[PDB]
């Protein structure tokens, strides 16, 4: 019978019993016991074991009783716009903040960017991965904003700098940027402010409209569906 | 319904989170408006005189303190040096301590703005509070002759004090915690006795004998901070408020009017900082902050041993 | 190895013994939100919104999006 | 010919047209490099004694993938600049426009891969443009890599040869060499698996020994500064059978002896 | 009184020079300009602030001054009018006017006034006007002295810096931008100090208005 | 108190007033490490020079679309003198000044405009040092650049002249450099035009032209020696290969 | 940099019974080298090693007179590698290992550095690596071994006992004494499957599972022993019997290497 | 008409609608009209604006500017209007009678005279070498030879839009010349002889250093006598 | 120093078996953390470790993750830079064999160890290595990073050996000074310590859910 709980280094099952295939949180490792070769699936995480049929069976370990990848859902902030694409920064990967520490208060008083202080010029490049407050970056091309009429899309009629956007990962890209898409009904703008971030919050009214409550002014966005 | 976890909401829209929490009478840190965090300390456990009968001989630490407040931990240690001194209530008759502050946030490199400003402000506030007189650091050196040392019940020397402060698990501004930890560590410092054997005179510290550090005990003060927020009608769930002991990401990102106080249990004040970059600051809020800081200092002074 | 032999080896190799510090004690020590969820942690809806405006907003999103209409017609072209 | 040095006067006749390696002032022509003087009709130029490989249209080269870019690859071929391989210059197993393959270019070629290519055209500054639009070009597998200076590769009409012992050699014009086990395509010379990283599961010990010996004799020929040709490679391989151990061919005296024997046999 | 001059440098957008007793500061402003990628803010203007001392090289003493100057200047500027742009502000102290080993408040006030004048000269959008004064309380007499000299600072008990915000023709106080008090004082002393400082700041801002109007008017038609 | 210049016209090492030290150079000494290399011996000086490039730039920031970028690095070892050096010389202002001077010298001579979007790197190692090191550096760089087949307009030759009261002395050593002021020169081809002129100590204004002329003649002789060595190596290379 | 197919081919060749190396060498066979000594006249000793793949190292030996009561260590090594920072991890690791192998009691006879009852010679070892393609610990060790066996020191001619009355040490102005200290050697090994390799090449290091560093002195294995990763994409664990095999291999084949470095 | 400061009361009746010009801000939170610049307030369907002194140019639609080509891309040029500022873009199809066969032939380092056509807040500004509003092509294009003079913005506005400004008339009384005026703070001049161009450059620099328009004639006479 | 307050220039410094406790997850602004505290007759040690990542990294594309380890002193500065860096390199070599780095392309993982407390109640850095390995293993498991096995270590007479797979494999070997002929005894003693440490680590992970 299969184990109920797992820790790193714990053997789960052999390859046959049905052909077993390692999923997330598991690995296949060679073992030598009593002078004979052995194959087994080994857990790599602390959690619980569940197997689903996909005969071929996939064995996975799920934490409980990260790093963005293709197919993931992310929450981003718009940084720059042009005629061909939008630049964003990733704030959360599947309802988990990324990074844990955003670096607030590290540069003193005022309103400063993460790399806009004195410590940015003295970071040890060769002894670490990145500096305090750095995030993953992504790019949304105009042809990826929607699935239809992807040759007449106007970027400034869809997003504005400072908006919060829900997107999905398409590719790992290069070492600088991921590639993202919003071409689905549940992807798009979730939070926005009037007067390009100087006013109050707006609420979604239609598939392509948001409204300011204090003064009944309207702007054009690509609204993600609420509820 | 579409819903975000509290950490995600604080990351993506801190102002809305703060406005929503306040309309219910609570804070994103899950406290009341005028409620402080609890404090627990552990004095003089890392020093070379921690055990009165068994003195460590490989330890050069003269005083120590460990402080815990919420989830934040502060460790303070004090060392010493000696300098040859060649050549009222006025500030020319007072000394200070030289601190170095490290806040662990996952970075390797030189100091940030936060660490440098905190160190400088600690030094300056120690100097301005008239806590450490210059005559309290004068060395009464002895002489060793055939070998024994005779102390007096030429040249002149003075003590020099250094401090090292390490902050772990930071969640907000940490100046008050560092100041309070250093105040606790200063009241437990012992100074080693010193003796002597173009000229070369070498002064040597005694291995086990020491004398206590004499400071103005009536000038000791304790720190607290406050914030002022203006309520937004469209964000309230189904006028200004005063908030004490700011913490967590949502509060530090959205609040730009703050008050800082150093208050002594005698009844006077040693420091006051007003910075209005947000809501308007009125005299009533200043008076309320002064009263609250007085109560907090009274609590922190008479709480241990 | 045989299936039974492999299972016995798996069972044998997975064995372990499952069983007053001042610093550890010092460091390692020790309803409104629950009833107010879905509003404290939801999307932004203005406080004073008439029910008519809310209903109109909800009704709009229960109709096909611009991509839906175009994708509906393209089915006949690309089978 | 005539050896000249930088700053040396070549001619003062106002009848010559100046080419590469020279500069002039009025009717005086000077040399900018150390080399030999070359004359073609009325064109005068100086050919340098040393330099890096310079690509030419139609060249057969071996290179390594350096960068994965925007609808293109960067390939290192040992020149002064990286070469360019456009996404439209390669053959895709499925197709080009299917209703991806622009964001998934690493599923075909990624950093570190070796490949076989031909020079298609040269850019304005001399950098090369590559293409892989034939069945004789693509990913390299089932063998070993070695390197010699490009000036030792004798110009010829064919650059892929079948050697005794079931071994095939690919002689790059830039000086990059690939030794591998002979396949069906090589024998016939005289879809989705063309981007596979798997080697043949049936490579025997004799082939490995032969590849080791061929690499050793190629290095020996390069040590003596003898131009590398197929006939010389075969002759040096056959003459090294005196030594039973392949590892004895790395000594200097053995390499010099092999080279001298090759030269003496040719000169006779 | 105080002396102020406007537009004295040639290769910056705006500049000024402020003199108060024996304290002398010169300031320059360049912006809006293109920032570095790591300084950029998506929706508003970014600031880069530098303060240099009269003697020696810059140390952690100048970092605190930069922090306080940044705190004062941030709410003054209409930052949302210049999305993802940069403004450089540099202050050089020429004469401290006090003993730098103990006091730094006169330099802070002079830097605040000089930076405001340079921002006006450059043409940056501003929400309102500002003025800053130093204050001290002297021993024995326990008198409150506005604009103390260097001799009065050596026998003081507490030193204060006050910066205020004025609107509607320089007659209405909008907010307290900065109050920085160090020493030993009680509540009555504090509330007397604020009342005196408000009047002194009002006089100073009226004088500054006159100087600005005298300097700027000849440049227009 | 020593006889720097005896009444019989002899110096401390036995040379006369207008004689060069022993000059030996080698070309193509590190074929596997660089495109061009040289080994220079001038008296008791020993220098290794390596030339790498033209090649692809490391970073996309250091790319120029009109010409190549030239970099020079100089390493002075801790054992190059009689007394061992306490600390490293890598980041001294003197070394940075030397590197900048060499780069600015050779920018005008190399035809950098025919190698756009490339970088050329020069790495130098000084093993032994006995006076007049700047001229030796210049000569080594020239030889290594020519060995790499990189286009240039002419030779540049380095030389040092010391002034002892009223007597000019050519190609001074460490003993003479510690007792008098010296002048360093960089001469182009066989002309009178100077690429470098470096005076670091006091010299009377009415005594500089004579020193300049003596140095120019010495540099012409140095250029002759370098050209002879290069031609001999080329003849040997082409004779058999 | 190698591709996946190249690495698979090379690993299949190396991890076979018997092992096949890319150049056909035996598991214990070394590659040819060239040695030059005594070419820096201003030093007490010097050497230069050139490897067959272009690697080159230069060593210099210099001395100084110190009070051997205040001074604790009489041998100091300083390492410089071209293209690396002075505070790089590999540079400092090599510096630490080389200072450990030449410590006071390690087989190095430091009694030969003593002059007068109060003073002694302190030896400075400076290493400069011009070009390298793999972990250069054994190349530097061989160069240091060659340089130390051709070192000459000044000869003292002014008293030996100075405990009571002390005179400044004075030395003969022309004569020198050869140093006959006993230097050690350091070897690096590669683990590829179930085989052990001596003196691995650059391409063999890219597929190795692990590595070992073993010291040798006057017929016996010496204290500094480490396990080292020669790459980062193929490092794995190894069984304990491979350690004993490596120790036996070094014990068996070290004496032959000693004879190759003589004179 | 009156001198105003930031934070002052705005002297306009809230009932009457007035279009807002430079120097006046509408608060996005309180919907209040307040001045943000220092200078003279002019009130003219009526328009109000503040005239203030400035040196740093900010692009605005329908402005005449002079730029420098600093980079060539696949489909457009990269153009600088002022040192240390963000660049603008000039499209290859923004020339008269332009097509994919009639390409422009400008190089890096050329001077151009153009008009600002797009100045969106969230994007990069664009310029064109022909007046698209009217179809007129009056002087737009490359400027060959000549010399460039830097001035402040008020001076450039006075030269371009005021016909009672006496500088061009006093310059025309000494020599024949060509001129182009850019609102970004640039003046281009050219004469047949280099000495005349130099005299014009010196006269313009000295006149801009001063504030009195009645001394222009004496300055011009002295400068043109200096060159002999 | 322009960034620190170091005081006057002329001043001079003053011149004058094991029981364990394991806890995880107590630092808020990092991904994983652990506290290790060991006591015996004549020694006492406390350690804290923290893990940051996976995070973004500067440079070109990399197909697998990168690990960095930083060691810092605490209270007393008992070790210099060179030996700390050597120990860091040894630890990085060990933990490149147990982390599943193929799962984290173009990202970095940064590990910090603080040497808080070390007192002699009755050759000194070698005995500290096993506790560092235990702390790093616990923090990596707490942060949710994939590990193929639980790594431990033991110390005996200047020799440190690190094991996986129930003590049948070696991931690290260290030896300084000591006896030349003593190898089997060291292996047996180190394995004996390793088994106990492994039991305690698994119990800590299983109980504190």
Swiss-Prot record, chain A:
UniProt keyword annotations, A-Z: Cytoplasm, Exosome, Nucleus, Phosphoprotein, RNA-binding, rRNA processing
GO cellular component: cytoplasm; cytoplasmic exosome (RNase complex); exosome (RNase complex); nuclear exosome (RNase complex); nucleolus; nucleus
Pfam families on file: CSL4_N (PF21551), EXOSC1 (PF10447)
Domain of life: Eukaryota
Any single biological process term in GO: nuclear-transcribed mRNA catabolic process
Disulfide partners: none
InterPro entries listed in its UniProt record: Csl4, CSL4_N, EXOSC1_C, NA-bd_OB-fold
Biological function: Non-catalytic component of the RNA exosome complex which has 3'->5' exoribonuclease activity and participates in a multitude of cellular RNA processing and degradation events. In the nucleus, the RNA exosome complex is involved in proper maturation of stable RNA species such as rRNA, snRNA and snoRNA, in the elimination of RNA processing by-products and non-coding 'pervasive' transcripts, such as antisense RNA species and cryptic unstable transcripts (CUTs), and of mRNAs with processing defects, thereby limiting or excluding their export to the cytoplasm.
Family in the record: Belongs to the CSL4 family.
Protein name: Exosome complex component CSL4
From Swiss-Prot, chain C:
Cellular compartments annotated: Cytoplasm
Entry superkingdom: Eukaryota
Note: Present with 233 molecules/cell in log phase SD medium.
UniProt similarity note: Belongs to the TRAFAC class translation factor GTPase superfamily. Classic translation factor GTPase family.
Domain notes: The N-terminal domain (residues 1 to 264) is required and sufficient for interaction with the exosome and SKI complexes and for 3'-to-5' mRNA degradation.
Cited function: Represses the expression of non-poly(A) mRNAs like L-A or M viruses and is therefore involved in antiviral system. Mediates interactions via its N-terminus between the exosome and the SKI complex which operate in the 3'-to-5' mRNA-decay pathway. By interacting with NAM7, is also required for nonsense-mediated 3'-to-5' mRNA-decay (NMD). May recognize a stalled 80S ribosome at the 3'-end of a nonstop mRNA which leads to the recruitment of the exosome and SKI complexes to the mRNAs to be degraded.
Subunit structure: Interacts with the exosome and with the SKI complex composed of at least SKI2, SKI3 and SKI8. Interacts directly with SKI3 and SKI8.
Protein name as annotated: Superkiller protein 7
Whole-protein coverage range: 119 to 225 of 747
From Swiss-Prot, chain D:
Species lineage: Eukaryota, Fungi, Dikarya, Ascomycota, Saccharomycotina
Keywords: Acetylation, Cytoplasm, Exosome, Nucleus, Phosphoprotein, RNA-binding, rRNA processing
Function: Non-catalytic component of the RNA exosome complex which has 3'->5' exoribonuclease activity and participates in a multitude of cellular RNA processing and degradation events. In the nucleus, the RNA exosome complex is involved in proper maturation of stable RNA species such as rRNA, snRNA and snoRNA, in the elimination of RNA processing by-products and non-coding 'pervasive' transcripts, such as antisense RNA species and cryptic unstable transcripts (CUTs), and of mRNAs with processing defects, thereby limiting or excluding their export to the cytoplasm.
Membrane-spanning parts: none
Family that this chain belongs to: Belongs to the RRP4 family.
Compartment list: Cytoplasm; Nucleus, Nucleolus
Miscellaneous remark of the record: Present with 4840 molecules/cell in log phase SD medium.
MF terms (GO), sorted A to Z: RNA binding
GO biological process per UniProt: CUT catabolic process; exonucleolytic trimming to generate mature 3'-end of 5.8S rRNA from tricistronic rRNA transcript (SSU-rRNA, 5.8S rRNA, LSU-rRNA); nuclear mRNA surveillance; nuclear polyadenylation-dependent rRNA catabolic process; nuclear-transcribed mRNA catabolic process; poly(A)-dependent snoRNA 3'-end processing; RNA catabolic process; RNA processing
Residue intervals of the S1 motif domain: 56-133
Keyword RNA-binding: yes
Top-level taxon of origin: Eukaryota
Residues of the full protein shown: 52 to 354 of 359
Predominant cellular place of this UniProt entry's protein: cytoplasm
From Swiss-Prot, chain G:
Superkingdom, taxonomy of origin: Eukaryota
Name of the protein: Exosome complex component RRP42
Further facts: Present with 7110 molecules/cell in log phase SD medium.
Annotated keywords: Cytoplasm, Exosome, Nucleus, RNA-binding, rRNA processing
Reported function: Non-catalytic component of the RNA exosome complex which has 3'->5' exoribonuclease activity and participates in a multitude of cellular RNA processing and degradation events. In the nucleus, the RNA exosome complex is involved in proper maturation of stable RNA species such as rRNA, snRNA and snoRNA, in the elimination of RNA processing by-products and non-coding 'pervasive' transcripts, such as antisense RNA species and cryptic unstable transcripts (CUTs), and of mRNAs with processing defects, thereby limiting or excluding their export to the cytoplasm.
Oligomeric and partner information: Component of the RNA exosome complex. Specifically part of the catalytically inactive RNA exosome core complex (Exo-9) which may associate with the catalytic subunits RRP6 and DIS3 in cytoplasmic- and nuclear-specific RNA exosome complex forms. Exo-9 is formed by a hexameric base ring of RNase PH domain-containing subunits and a cap ring consisting of CSL4, RRP4 and RRP40.
Chief location of this protein within or outside the cell: cytoplasm
Family label: Belongs to the RNase PH family.
Location in the cell: Cytoplasm; Nucleus, Nucleolus
The UniProt record lists the keyword RNA-binding: yes
GO molecular function annotation: mRNA 3'-UTR AU-rich region binding
Coiled-coil boundaries: none
SUPFAM superfamilies on file: Ribosomal protein S5 domain 2-like (SSF54211)
């Amino acid at each position: 019978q299969f184990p109920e709980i797992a820790y790193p280094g714990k053997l789960i099952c052999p390859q046959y019993g049905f052909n077993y295939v390692p999923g997330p949180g598991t690995k296949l490792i060679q073992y030598e016991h009593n002078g004979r070769t052995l194959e087994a699936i080994t857990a790599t995480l602390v959690g619980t074991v569940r197997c689903e049929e996909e005969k071929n069976i996939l064995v996975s370990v799920l934490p409980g009783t990260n790093l963005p990848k293709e197919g993931d859902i992310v929450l981003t902030r718009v940084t720059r716009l042009s005629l061909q694409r939008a630049n964003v920064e990733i704030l959360a990967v599947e309802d988990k903040p990324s990074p844990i520490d955003s670096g607030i208060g590290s540069n003193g008083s005022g309103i400063v960017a993460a790399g806009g202080g004195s410590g940015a010029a003295t970071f040890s490049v060769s002894q670490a991965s990145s500096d305090l407050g750095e995030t993953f970056r992504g790019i949304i091309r105009s042809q990826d904003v929607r699935s239809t009429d992807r040759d007449r899309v106007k970027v400034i009629e869809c997003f504005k700098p400072g908006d919060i956007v829900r997107a999905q990962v398409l590719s790992l890209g290069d070492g600088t940027n991921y590639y993202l898409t919003t071409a689905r009904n549940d992807l798009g703008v979730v939070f926005a402010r009037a007067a390009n971030g100087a006013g109050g919050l707006m609420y979604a009214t239609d598939w392509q409209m948001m409204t300011s409550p204090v003064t009944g002014a309207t702007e054009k966005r690509k609204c993600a569906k609420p509820f | 319904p579409i819903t975000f976890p509290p950490e995600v909401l604080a990351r993506i829209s801190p102002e809305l989170s703060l406005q929503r929490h306040l309309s219910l009478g609570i804070r994103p840190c899950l406290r009341k408006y005028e409620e402080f965090r609890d404090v627990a300390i552990e004095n003089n456990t890392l020093s070379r005189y921690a055990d009165a009968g068994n003195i460590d001989t490989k330890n050069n630490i003269l005083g120590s303190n460990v402080l815990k407040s919420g989830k934040t931990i502060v460790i303070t240690s004090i060392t010493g040096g000696i300098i040859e001194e060649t050549s009222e209530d006025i500030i020319a008759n007072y000394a200070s301590v030289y601190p170095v502050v490290e806040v662990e946030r996952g970075r390797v490199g030189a100091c940030t703005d936060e660490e440098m400003t905190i160190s400088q402000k600690l030094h300056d506030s120690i100097l301005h509070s008239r806590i450490l007189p210059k005559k309290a650091l004068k060395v009464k050196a002895g002489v060793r002759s055939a070998f024994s040392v005779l102390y007096p019940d030429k040249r002149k020397w003075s003590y020099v004090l250094y401090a090292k402060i390490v902050v772990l698990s930071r969640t907000g501004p940490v100046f008050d915690l560092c100041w309070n930890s250093l105040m606790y560590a200063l009241q437990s410092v012992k100074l080693p006795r010193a003796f002597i054997d173009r000229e070369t005179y070498e002064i040597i510290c005694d291995q086990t004998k020491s004398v206590p550090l004499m400071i103005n005990a009536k000038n000791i003060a304790f720190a607290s901070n406050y914030g002022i927020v203006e309520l937004d009608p469209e964000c309230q769930l189904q006028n200004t408020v005063l908030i004490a002991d700011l913490d967590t990401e949502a509060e530090e990102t959205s609040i730009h009017s703050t008050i800082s106080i150093l208050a002594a249990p005698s009844g006077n004040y040693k420091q006051l900082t007003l910075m209005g970059g947000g809501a308007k600051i009125t005299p009533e809020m200043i008076k309320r902050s002064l009263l609250l800081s007085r109560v907090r200092a009274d609590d922190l002074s008479t709480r241990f041993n | 190895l045989n299936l039974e032999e492999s299972w016995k080896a798996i069972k044998e190799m997975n064995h372990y013994c499952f069983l007053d510090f001042a610093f550890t004690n010092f460091i390692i020590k020790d309803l409104s939100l629950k009833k107010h969820n879905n509003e404290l942690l939801g999307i932004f809806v203005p406080c004073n919104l008439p029910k008519t405006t809310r209903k109109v907003a909800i009704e709009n999103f229960n109709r096909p999006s611009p991509d839906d209409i175009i994708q509906s017609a393209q089915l006949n072209a690309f089978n | 010919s005539q050896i000249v040095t930088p700053g040396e006067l070549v001619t003062d006749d106002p009848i010559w047209m100046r080419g590469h390696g020279t500069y002039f002032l009025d009717n005086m022509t000077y040399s900018s490099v150390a080399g030999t003087v070359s004359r073609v009709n009325r064109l005068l130029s100086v050919i340098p004694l040393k330099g890096r490989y310079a690509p030419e249209t139609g060249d057969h080269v071996v290179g390594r993938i350096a960068e994965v870019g925007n609808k293109r690859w960067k390939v290192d071929i040992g020149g002064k600049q990286h070469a360019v391989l456009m996404l439209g210059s390669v053959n895709l197993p499925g197709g080009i426009l299917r209703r991806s393959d622009e964001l998934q270019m690493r599923s075909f070629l990624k950093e570190g891969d070796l490949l076989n290519a031909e020079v298609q055209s040269l850019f304005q500054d001399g950098s090369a443009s590559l293409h892989t639009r034939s069945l004789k070009y693509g990913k390299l597998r089932n063998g070993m890599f070695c390197q010699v200076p490009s000036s030792l590769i004798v110009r010829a009409k064919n650059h892929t040869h079948n050697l005794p012992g079931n071994i095939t050699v690919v002689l790059g014009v830039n000086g990059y060499i690939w030794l591998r086990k002979t396949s069906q395509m090589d024998l016939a010379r005289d879809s989705w698996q063309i981007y596979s990283d798997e080697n043949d599961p049936s490579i025997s010990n004799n082939i490995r020994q032969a590849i080791c010996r061929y690499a050793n004799v190629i290095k020996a020929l390069a040590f003596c500064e003898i131009g590398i040709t197929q006939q010389r490679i075969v002759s040096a391989y056959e003459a090294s059978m005196v030594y039973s151990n392949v590892g004895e061919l790395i000594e200097k005296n053995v390499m010099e002896s092999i080279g001298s024997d090759i030269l003496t046999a040719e000169k006779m | 009184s105080v002396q102020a001059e406007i537009g004295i440098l040639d290769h910056v957008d705006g500049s000024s020079e402020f003199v108060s007793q024996d304290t002398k500061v010169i300031c320059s402003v360049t912006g809006p300009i293109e920032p570095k990628a790591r300084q950029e803010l998506p929706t508003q203007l970014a600031l880069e602030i530098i303060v240099r001392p009269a003697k020696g090289v810059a140390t952690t003493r100048e970092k605190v001054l930069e922090d306080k100057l940044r705190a004062v200047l941030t709410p003054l500027i209409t930052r949302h009018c210049y999305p993802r742009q940069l403004c450089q502000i540099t202050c050089q102290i020429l004469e401290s006017g006090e003993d730098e080993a103990e006091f730094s408040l006169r330099e802070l006030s002079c830097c605040i006034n000089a930076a405001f004048l340079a921002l006006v000269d450059a043409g940056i959008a501003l929400n309102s006007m500002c003025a800053s004064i130093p204050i001290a309380i002297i021993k024995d007499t326990s008198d409150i002295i506005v604009d103390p000299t260097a001799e009065q600072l050596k026998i003081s008990l507490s030193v204060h810096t006050l910066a205020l915000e004025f609107v509607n023709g320089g007659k209405v106080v909008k907010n307290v931008l900065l109050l920085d008090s160090n020493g030993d004082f009680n509540e009555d002393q504090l509330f007397s100090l604020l009342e005196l400082g408000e009047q002194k700041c009002q006089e100073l801002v009226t004088n500054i208005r006159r100087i600005i109007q005298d300097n700027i008017s000849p440049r227009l038609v | 108190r020593l006889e720097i210049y005896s009444p019989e016209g002899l110096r401390l090492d036995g040379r006369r007033w207008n004689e060069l030290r022993r000059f030996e150079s080698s070309i193509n000494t590190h074929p596997h490490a660089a495109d061009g290399s040289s080994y220079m011996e001038q008296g008791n000086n020993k220098i290794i020079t390596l030339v790498k490039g033209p090649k692809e730039p490391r970073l996309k920031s250091q790319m120029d679309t009109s010409k190549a970028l030239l970099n020079v690095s100089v390493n002075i070892t801790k054992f190059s003198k009689f007394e061992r050096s306490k600390s490293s010389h890598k980041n001294e202002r003197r070394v940075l000044e030397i590197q900048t001077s060499l780069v600015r010298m050779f920018e005008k001579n190399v035809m950098l405009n025919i190698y756009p979007r490339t970088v050329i790197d020069i790495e130098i190692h000084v093993l032994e040092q006995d006076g007049g090191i700047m001229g030796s550096l210049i000569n080594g760089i020239t030889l290594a650049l020519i060995d790499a087949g990189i286009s240039m307009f002419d030779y540049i030759s380095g030389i040092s002249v010391g002034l002892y009261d009223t007597t000019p002395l050519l190609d001074t050593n460490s003993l003479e450099e510690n007792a008098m002021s010296t002048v360093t020169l960089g001469v182009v081809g066989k002309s009178e035009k100077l690429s470098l002129l470096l005076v670091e100590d006091k010299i009377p204004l009415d005594r500089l032209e004579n020193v300049l002329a003596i140095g120019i003649a010495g540099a012409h002789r140095v250029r002759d020696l370098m050209d002879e060595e290069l031609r001999k190596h080329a003849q040997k290379r082409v004779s058999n290969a | 940099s190698l591709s996946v197919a190249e690495k698979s081919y090379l690993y299949d060749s190396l991890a076979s019974t018997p092992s096949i190396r890319p150049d056909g060498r035996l598991p214990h066979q070394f590659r040819p080298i060239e040695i030059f000594t005594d070419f820096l006249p201003s030093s007490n000793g010097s050497s230069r090693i050139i490897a067959s793949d272009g690697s080159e190292c230069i060593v210099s030996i210099k001395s100084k007179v110190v009070d051997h009561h205040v001074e604790n260590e009489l041998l100091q090594v300083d390492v410089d590698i071209a293209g690396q920072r002075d505070d790089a991890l590999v540079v400092e690791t090599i510096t630490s290992l080389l200072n450990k192998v030449l410590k006071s009691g390690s087989g190095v006879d430091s009694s030969k550095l003593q002059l007068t009852k109060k003073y002694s010679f302190k030896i400075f070892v400076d290493v400069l690596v011009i070009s390298s393609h793999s972990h250069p610990i054994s190349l530097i060790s061989f160069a240091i071994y060659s340089a130390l066996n051709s070192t000459y020191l000044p000869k003292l001619i002014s008293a030996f006992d100075d405990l009571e009355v002390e005179e400044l040490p004075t030395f003969h102005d022309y004569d020198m004494v050869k140093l006959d200290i006993n230097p050690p050697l350091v070897f690096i090994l590669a683990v590829v499957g179930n085989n052990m390799l001596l003196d691995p090449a650059a391409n063999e290091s890219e597929v190795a599972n692990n590595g070992l560093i073993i010291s040798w002195s006057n017929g016996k294995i010496t204290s500094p022993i480490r396990s080292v990763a020669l790459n980062d994409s193929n490092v794995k664990s190894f069984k304990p019997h491979l350690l004993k095999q490596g120790l036996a291999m070094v014990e068996k084949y070290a004496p032959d290497v000693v004879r190759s470095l003589e004179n | 008409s009156t001198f105003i400061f930031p934070g002052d009361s705005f002297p306009v009746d809230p009932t009457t609608p007035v279009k807002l010009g430079p120097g006046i801000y509408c608060d996005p939170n309180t919907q209040e009209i307040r001045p943000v610049n220092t200078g003279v307030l002019h009130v003219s369907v009526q328009t109000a604006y503040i005239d203030y002194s400035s040196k740093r140019y900010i692009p605005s639609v329908n402005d005449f500017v002079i730029g420098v080509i600093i980079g060539t891309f696949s489909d457009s040029y990269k153009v600088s209007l002022q040192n240390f500022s963000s660049s603008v873009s000039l499209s290859y199809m923004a020339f008269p009678n332009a097509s994919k066969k009639n390409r422009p032939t400008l190089q890096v380092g050329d001077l151009v005279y153009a008009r600002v056509c797009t100045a969106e807040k969230e994007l990069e500004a664009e310029i064109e070498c022909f007046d698209s509003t009217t179809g007129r092509d009056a002087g737009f294009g490359i400027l060959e030879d000549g010399m460039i003079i830097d001035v402040n913005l008020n001076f450039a506005r006075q030269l371009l839009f005021n016909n009672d400004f006496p500088l061009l008339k006093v310059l025309a009384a000494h020599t024949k010349f060509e001129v182009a005026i850019g609102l970004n703070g640039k003046i281009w001049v050219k004469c047949e002889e280099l000495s005349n161009t130099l005299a014009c450059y010196r006269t313009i620099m000295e006149c801009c250093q001063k504030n009195d328009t009645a001394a222009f004639k004496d300055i011009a006479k002295r400068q043109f006598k200096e060159i002999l | 120093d322009r960034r620190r307050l170091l005081g006057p220039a002329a001043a001079k410094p003053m011149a004058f078996e094991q029981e364990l406790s394991l806890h995880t997850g107590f630092i808020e602004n990092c991904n994983g953390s652990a506290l290790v505290e060991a006591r015996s007759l004549g020694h006492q040690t406390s350690l804290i470790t923290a893990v940051y990542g996976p995070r973004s990294i500067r440079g070109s594309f990399t197909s697998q993750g990168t690990i960095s380890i930083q060691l810092k002193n605490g209270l007393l500065e008992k070790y210099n830079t060179n030996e700390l860096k050597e120990v860091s390199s040894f630890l990085m070599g060990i933990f490149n064999s147990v982390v599943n780095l193929s799962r984290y392309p173009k990202s970095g993982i940064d590990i910090f160890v603080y040497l808080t407390y070390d007192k002699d109640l009755t050759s000194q850095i070698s005995s500290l290595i096993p506790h560092c390995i235990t702390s790093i293993t616990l923090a990596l498991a707490d942060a949710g990073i994939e590990l193929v096995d639980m790594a431990g270590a033991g110390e005996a007479n200047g020799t440190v050996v690190s094991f996986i797979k129930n003590g049948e494999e070696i991931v690290g070997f260290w030896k300084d000074d000591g006896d030349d002929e003593d190898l089997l005894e060291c292996l047996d003693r180190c394995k004996e310590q390793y088994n106990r440490y492994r039991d305690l680590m698994i119990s800590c992970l299983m109980n504190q859910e």
